[PDB]
Structure 1
Amino acid sequence: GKIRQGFIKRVARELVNKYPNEFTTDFEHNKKKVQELTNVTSKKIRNRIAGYVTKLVRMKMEG
């Protein structure tokens, strides 16, 4: 099961809402920005959140 957990899906939306201008399609850029804008200790969770906010940024401009 690849299903993204509910809580990372939740936490992704408010980043996009609060600082839409600070995130791009670059995975590593979003990774640093969510690393600093949050208090995540788990690197795996950091990467998950980055990989989903990247898709959110992608969907923002596709429609």
Structure 2
Amino acid sequence: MGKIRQGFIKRVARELVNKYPNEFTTDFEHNKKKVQELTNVTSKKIRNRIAGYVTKLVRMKMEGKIL
């Protein structure tokens, strides 16, 4: 029916680009290696998402407006 990423997923990717912004990239797997080591892996599927948002949060930080 409809798609929207959860707020736990956005709380987490937002502060993870806040503390260590420069240890993140515009590759998917690398951030995904880093997210693994910083905050818990309650599972595998969520660990791809947070990582999916962090990549978009590095694309927007170049632009000038990041929400």
Same fold (TM over 0.5): yes
Could you tell me which runs of 5 or more consecutive residues in structure 1 were left unpaired when the two chains were aligned.
Answer: none
Question: Identity of counterpart residues, as a percentage?
Answer: 100
**For the aligned residues, what is the CA RMSD?**
0.8
Q: Which runs of 5+ in 2 are unaligned?
A: none
TM-score when normalising by structure 2: 0.88
Normalising by structure 1, report the TM-score: 0.93
Q: Give 4+ residue runs of structure 1 displaced > 3 Å after superposition.
A: none
More helix by percentage: 1
Partner Cα separation in structure 2 for residue 62 and residue 29 of structure 1: 22
Bigger Rg, which one: 2
Distance (Å, rounded) in 2 between the aligned partners of 1:7 and 1:43: 15
How many aligned residue pairs are there? 63
Alpha-carbon shift at residue 41 of structure 1 (Å) = 2.9
